[PDB]
Design a protein around this ligand. Structure first.
Ligand SMILES: *[C@@H]1O[C@H](CO)[C@@H](O[C@@H]2O[C@H](CO)[C@@H](O[C@@H]3O[C@H](CO[C@H]4O[C@H](CO[C@H]5O[C@H](CO)[C@@H](O)[C@H](O)[C@@H]5O)[C@@H](O)[C@H](O)[C@@H]4O[C@H]4O[C@H](CO)[C@@H](O)[C@H](O)[C@@H]4O)[C@@H](O)[C@H](O[C@H]4O[C@H](CO)[C@@H](O)[C@H](O)[C@@H]4O)[C@@H]3O)[C@H](O)[C@H]2NC(C)=O)[C@H](O)[C@H]1NC(C)=O
Ligand SMILES: *[C@@H]1O[C@H](CO)[C@@H](O[C@@H]2O[C@H](CO)[C@@H](O[C@@H]3O[C@H](CO[C@H]4O[C@H](CO)[C@@H](O)[C@H](O)[C@@H]4O)[C@@H](O)[C@H](O[C@H]4O[C@H](CO)[C@@H](O)[C@H](O)[C@@H]4O)[C@@H]3O)[C@H](O)[C@H]2NC(C)=O)[C@H](O)[C@H]1NC(C)=O
Ligand SMILES: *[C@@H]1O[C@H](CO)[C@@H](O[C@@H]2O[C@H](CO)[C@@H](O)[C@H](O)[C@H]2NC(C)=O)[C@H](O)[C@H]1NC(C)=O
Ligand SMILES: *[C@@H]1O[C@H](CO)[C@@H](O[C@@H]2O[C@H](CO)[C@@H](O)[C@H](O)[C@H]2NC(C)=O)[C@H](O)[C@H]1NC(C)=O
Ligand SMILES: *[C@@H]1O[C@H](CO)[C@@H](O[C@@H]2O[C@H](CO)[C@@H](O)[C@H](O)[C@H]2NC(C)=O)[C@H](O)[C@H]1NC(C)=O
Ligand SMILES: *[C@@H]1O[C@H](CO)[C@@H](O)[C@H](O)[C@H]1NC(C)=O
Ligand SMILES: *[C@@H]1O[C@H](CO)[C@@H](O)[C@H](O)[C@H]1NC(C)=O
Ligand SMILES: *[C@@H]1O[C@H](CO)[C@@H](O)[C@H](O)[C@H]1NC(C)=O
Ligand SMILES: *[C@@H]1O[C@H](CO)[C@@H](O)[C@H](O)[C@H]1NC(C)=O
Ligand SMILES: *[C@@H]1O[C@H](CO)[C@@H](O)[C@H](O)[C@H]1NC(C)=O
Ligand SMILES: *[C@@H]1O[C@H](CO)[C@@H](O)[C@H](O)[C@H]1NC(C)=O
Ligand SMILES: *[C@@H]1O[C@H](CO)[C@@H](O)[C@H](O)[C@H]1NC(C)=O
Ligand SMILES: *[C@@H]1O[C@H](CO)[C@@H](O)[C@H](O)[C@H]1NC(C)=O
Ligand SMILES: *[C@@H]1O[C@H](CO)[C@@H](O)[C@H](O)[C@H]1NC(C)=O
Ligand SMILES: *[C@@H]1O[C@H](CO)[C@@H](O)[C@H](O)[C@H]1NC(C)=O
Ligand SMILES: *[C@@H]1O[C@H](CO)[C@@H](O)[C@H](O)[C@H]1NC(C)=O
Lengths: 119, 97, 557, 119
């Protein structure tokens, strides 16, 4: 059973940064891509990026380039999402996800509990 | 459990010794030779199989729940105390003289 | 007249031992009793009842039990190979009793031990406070870990769990596993309901020493299996009819702390207990256990006199693995005092539980080996296990004079007994595809029709032959399968039979070779009975086949 | 060459305890059951017990239960027979033995030199 456990219940003011810790278990962390997705109410979910936590390669969404950093602790099996320059439009539940198969990143069968963030 | 007989055998060298041992159990019966001052080395096991190093003068044969150790041509190195053992239970022993 | 005919693929086998391969059900299950050399298994693709086959089994003289002993030890050692060695932990411990802030003496048999230990850096040391069990330390106050002066203690990797998983042992090419389906089968002698399987039903390596946990149950009644019962040394393996539920617990939070003791080497230890210091224990259902002992003494009275007295008693002695019921529970190793169970006397004619005190050990010298020991890291939280007692290992006190009363105690000390109680119904046999039979020609799945008469069983030879040719020891087994195949094909080639499968040749049959006027040979006898009847003549028949083919080839060519 | 070397010639008074060591060599100590036999002079000899040194499992003769204990070390391949509450009927030559084939312990081919005990 794959499980992603996310911290949350954070509230931030505009101009501050936020950091979300996603601890992964039930699969080999190193060998499978994790994604961060922004699910705001009302508007379409915005996929924020992917992290391949072996080399640490990242891909940040174009509108979020320069604002989002993703890192990993490969020894604690934990992915981290850092979002900077927060505004009121960043209110959303942030999710840590994994694809169904590690061959195909975007079949997100495994979602975390969610990280509500209100700005 | 098992009764060995006779208690003592008076025998001169060259005679054949027959040592009987009756038992009320079904088990492999072994025979041990205790030379005075020495450990009781195994003579035969399984009721008829010789232990390594034992001359072919030692044998066993009988029918039913009873065993007999036949020792032909007794030498000066024999005439010890002989014991029968079945499954941890030892006969009272026969002293061969 | 009668002539030798060579049949390749006859359903004939011998009691030959070999190396069986691992098969298991297909992340977290790859860190539990696994080497990653165990192939994915199939959902029981083949189980073929060998109708009219009677086979002789001996559960105490087979190489499946010895193979499990070797394979489980290797599997254990590989699980512990890429893990932290605790040589840095073999240090002088300054241990005091765990304190309650009062005058009460040691509770829980725990010792609070302050030691200086190595750190990630070699130039610095970290003072560590760890709650070790009394059974893990020896006084030298100053203490040392019990196995530091005799063995290299290896810490289990924290990701590795000791929960048992089913392991299927499978026949290599050229071999079959026979299963005994007889109900009430006592593991020895003839078996009437015999089947051919590629693999076992899945044997869980459930480590236990006195009671058999999470095993198979007897089909109709308690089965007491011993090579010989009157022999004390031969342990008595009791397979129960209906299990006895045993609820085991470690009622201590055992807050786990960890330190670095070297580059990449994390040592896990018990830091504190937030609640009261409580003794680990197991609850065996009292009514169920009493009924179970009733059934066991009824079966022993069947083995002994019907008017005898059967007394149960605690283990007579030995190490903790023998004097107590050892087992894994949730990652901790329990050593339960079974004197609460083996204490009744049965004389031939309530919802309460029997609580067995259990001690917990962290340093486990499993299989009592020289130079090896494992340190089980503590598990965070209160441990609960509900296990099924499906059997017992018993011994009987010797020196039984005044034999009206017999005394039985729990056994242990030889882990192979746990596997015997699971492998009691299995044996490994080598296929002998080359058979000879008298004929006048003078020129279903695997092992199906093995119990059929010959002739009828000679129309399935290709089904039998198709199951041939299907780390170091496994590759040697594969090469042996290839060499045996090639020796049979080479021998057929010498006979001029390599491509015929049924080869009629010019060798007269000698009437001394159980002639039986042919009608019995083909209408009454099976291939197994026939091979047994001429097992002392096949070398002569083979030599005559070689001579006849040589003479015919030289005369014709 | 299988050999059992025993320390003996010990004299004890009734009520005292005794311990007889048996060092074994020529075979794997762990893998073979060792037996302790009491050859009392003039009396039916008695097999005191067997000890399976791998786990140290032990089986004591019923008439001796509660008075005989057997222990061992496996790093120095030594078995120990310990008796308590000795009486005058415990005078005997005590032997440490091993079977011809460890599968069957009872047929005892290898015997120690013998340890007389006078009580
Ligand atoms: C634990 O392990 C032990 C040993 O490891 C097992 O013991 C064996 O038990 C089996 C069956 O349980 C025994 O087989 C039976 O043996 C019967 C007797 O066999 C001995 O005697 C006969 C001749 O005896 C005849 O004459 C006697 C007159 O005194 C009379 O009392 C008796 O009834 C017979 O009429 C011999 O031919 C045979 O070789 C054997 O010899 C014994 O004595 C010699 C002494 O030199 C010794 O070497 C042998 O080892 C043995 O002690 C036998 O009658 C019985 O036959 C049955 O079948 C035939 C079928 O034709 C049938 O006609 C007959 O009526 C019976 O039903 C069968 O062969 C075997 O002998 C035991 N072996 C040993 C070594 O003890 C034990 O069973 C096992 N227990 C458990 C619980 O697993
Ligand atoms: C005989 O057989 C019984 C039944 O199989 C065994 O008892 C089981 O033992 C296992 C291992 O100790 C237990 O599994 C553990 O359960 C814990 C509780 O899980 C609860 O929640 C899950 C949610 O899915 C449920 O499935 C489950 O039923 C419980 O409600 C878990 O927390 C444990 O996981 C922890 O450890 C593992 C590694 O061991 C890690 O992978 C996890 O991340 C986590 O840290 C674990 O899964 C099982 O619950 C027991 N069942 C019963 C009925 O008792 C006996 O142990 C076995 N006998 C012997 C001698 O081995
Ligand atoms: C084990 O011993 C250590 C010290 O030997 C104890 O740790 C101290 O506990 C007291 C409790 O009042 C604290 O005030 C100290 O600050 C602690 N010292 C250190 C260095 O940690 C520990 O509590 C003992 N644990 C148990 C369970 O007895
Ligand atoms: C390794 O250490 C153990 C424990 O010190 C030794 O075994 C015996 O343990 C008991 C425990 O009560 C002591 O009373 C004995 O004195 C110990 N014997 C000896 C000879 O020290 C064990 O023998 C040690 N191993 C080795 C190879 O010396
Ligand atoms: C298991 O518990 C029993 C008690 O149920 C222990 O037996 C006691 O052992 C001591 C040893 O000195 C004796 O003095 C007591 O009289 C025994 N008690 C009873 C009630 O008979 C036994 O030793 C324990 N065994 C283990 C392995 O822990
Ligand atoms: C610890 O408890 C044991 C219990 O037997 C006692 O003998 C010992 O003296 C105690 N030690 C301390 C330091 O309290
Ligand atoms: C740890 O080392 C110090 C010296 O650095 C010493 O005084 C102290 O007693 C040692 N403590 C233990 C528990 O070994
Ligand atoms: C074999 O199986 C059949 C199935 O009908 C059963 O009747 C028979 O009793 C079984 N044999 C034994 C020895 O249990
Ligand atoms: C029990 O085993 C003995 C041999 O030890 C055998 O003769 C007997 O038939 C077996 N009992 C059953 C019910 O299969
Ligand atoms: C224990 O026995 C019960 C009997 O109903 C069974 O349902 C359960 O699956 C068994 N558990 C194990 C672990 O064997
Ligand atoms: C075996 O267990 C069943 C319940 O599964 C029970 O009815 C039967 O009586 C038990 N056998 C004996 C011999 O008590
Ligand atoms: C064990 O201690 C931890 C400390 O965080 C606590 O959260 C947990 O609930 C405790 N467990 C029990 C069973 O009380
Ligand atoms: C064991 O615990 C279970 C709950 O996990 C309970 O239903 C069962 O009755 C308990 N058994 C015993 C023998 O205490
Ligand atoms: C319970 O155990 C006692 C032990 O003395 C026995 O007498 C009684 O018959 C048993 N009751 C059963 C099996 O119902
Ligand atoms: C077993 O024997 C019976 C005897 O009637 C026969 O009918 C049956 O076909 C035989 N089994 C096989 C597999 O040939
Ligand atoms: C048959 O066996 C007898 C045994 O004396 C032997 O003399 C004879 O030559 C054999 N015949 C054949 C054809 O093998």
């Amino acid at each position: 059973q794959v499980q992603l456990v996310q911290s949350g219940g954070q509230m931030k003011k505009p101009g501050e940064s936020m950091r979300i810790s996603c601890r992964a278990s039930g699969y080999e962390f190193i060998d499978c891509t994790l994604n961060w997705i922004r699910l705001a109410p009302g508007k379409r979910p915005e996929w924020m990026g992917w992290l391949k936590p072996r080399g640490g390669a990242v891909n940040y969404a174009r509108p979020l380039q320069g604002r989002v950093t993703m890192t990993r602790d490969v020894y604690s099996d934990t992915a981290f999402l850092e979002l900077r320059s927060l505004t009121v439009d960043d209110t959303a539940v942030y999710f840590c996800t994994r694809g169904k198969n590690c061959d195909y990143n975007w079949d997100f069968e495994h979602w975390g509990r969610g990280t509500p963030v209100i700005v | 459990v098992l009764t060995q007989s006779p208690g003592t055998l008076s025998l001169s060298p060259g005679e054949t010794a027959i040592i009987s041992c009756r038992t009320s159990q079904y088990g492999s019966l072994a025979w041990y030779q205790q030379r005075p001052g020495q450990a009781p080395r195994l003579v035969i096991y399984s009721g008829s199989t010789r232990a390594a190093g034992i001359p072919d003068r030692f044998s066993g044969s009988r029918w039913g729940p009873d065993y007999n150790l036949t020792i032909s041509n007794l030498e000066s190195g024999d005439f010890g105390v002989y014991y029968c053992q079945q499954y941890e239970f030892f006969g009272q022993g026969t002293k061969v003289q | 007249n009668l002539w030798v005919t060579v049949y390749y693929g006859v359903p004939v086998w011998k009691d030959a031992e070999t190396t069986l391969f691992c098969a298991s059900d297909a992340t977290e299950k790859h860190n539990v009793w696994a080497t990653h050399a165990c192939v994915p298994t199939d959902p029981n693709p083949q189980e073929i009842h060998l109708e009219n086959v009677t086979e002789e089994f001996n559960m105490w003289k087979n190489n499946m039990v010895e193979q499990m002993h070797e394979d489980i030890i290797s599997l254990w050692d590989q699980s512990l190979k890429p893990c932290v060695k605790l040589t840095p932990l073999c240090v002088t411990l300054q241990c005091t009793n765990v304190t309650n802030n009062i005058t009460d003496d040691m509770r829980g048999e725990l010792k609070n031990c302050s030691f200086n230990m190595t750190t990630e850096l070699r130039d610095k040391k970290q003072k560590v406070y760890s709650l070790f069990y009394r059974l893990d330390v020896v006084q030298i106050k100053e203490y040392r870990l019990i196995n530091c002066n005799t063995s290299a203690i290896t810490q289990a990797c924290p990701k590795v769990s000791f929960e048992p998983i089913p392991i299927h042992y499978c026949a290599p090419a050229g071999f079959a596993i026979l299963k005994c389906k007889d109900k009430k089968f006592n593991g020895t002698g003839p078996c009437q309901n015999v089947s051919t399987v590629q693999c076992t039903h899945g044997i869980k390596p459930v480590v236990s020493t006195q009671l058999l946990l999470n095993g198979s149950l007897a089909e109709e009644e308690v089965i007491i299996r011993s090579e010989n019962i009157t022999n004390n040394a031969k342990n008595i393996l009791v397979q129960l009819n209906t299990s006895v539920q045993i609820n085991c617990t470690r009622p201590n939070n055992n807050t786990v702390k960890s330190i670095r003791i070297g580059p990449g080497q994390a040592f896990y230890y018990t830091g504190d207990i937030i609640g009261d210091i409580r003794q680990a224990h197991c609850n065996v259902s009292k009514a169920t256990w009493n009924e179970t002992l009733g059934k066991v003494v009824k079966q022993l009275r069947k083995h002994f006199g019907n008017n005898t007295i059967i007394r149960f008693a605690q283990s007579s002695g030995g190490d903790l693995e023998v004097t107590t019921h050892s087992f894994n529970c949730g990652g901790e190793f329990f050593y339960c005092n079974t004197s609460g169970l083996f204490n009744s006397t049965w004389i031939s004619n309530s919802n309460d539980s029997i609580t067995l005190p259990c001690r917990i050990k962290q340093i486990i010298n499993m299989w009592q080996r020289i130079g090896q020991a494992m340190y089980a890291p503590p598990i965070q939280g209160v441990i609960r296990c509900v296990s099924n007692i499906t059997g017992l290992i018993l011994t009987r006190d010797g020196g039984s004079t005044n034999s009206t009363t017999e005394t039985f105690r729990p056994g242990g000390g030889d882990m192979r007994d746990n596997w015997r109680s699971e492998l009691y119904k299995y044996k490994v046999v080598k296929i002998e595809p080359l058979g000879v039979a008298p004929t006048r020609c003078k020129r279903l799945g695997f092992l199906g029709a093995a119990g059929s008469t010959m002739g009828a069983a000679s129309m399935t030879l290709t089904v039998q032959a198709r199951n041939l040719l299907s780390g170091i020891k496994q590759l040697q087994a594969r090469v042996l399968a290839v060499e045996h195949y090639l020796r049979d094909q080479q021998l057929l080639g010498i006979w001029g039979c390599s491509g015929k499968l049924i080869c009629c040749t010019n060798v007269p049959w000698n009437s001394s070779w159980s002639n039986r006027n042919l009608s019995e040979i083909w209408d009454n006898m099976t291939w197994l009975q026939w091979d047994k009847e001429i097992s002392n003549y096949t070398q002569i028949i083979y030599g005559l086949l070689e001579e006849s083919q040589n003479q015919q080839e030289k005369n014709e060519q």
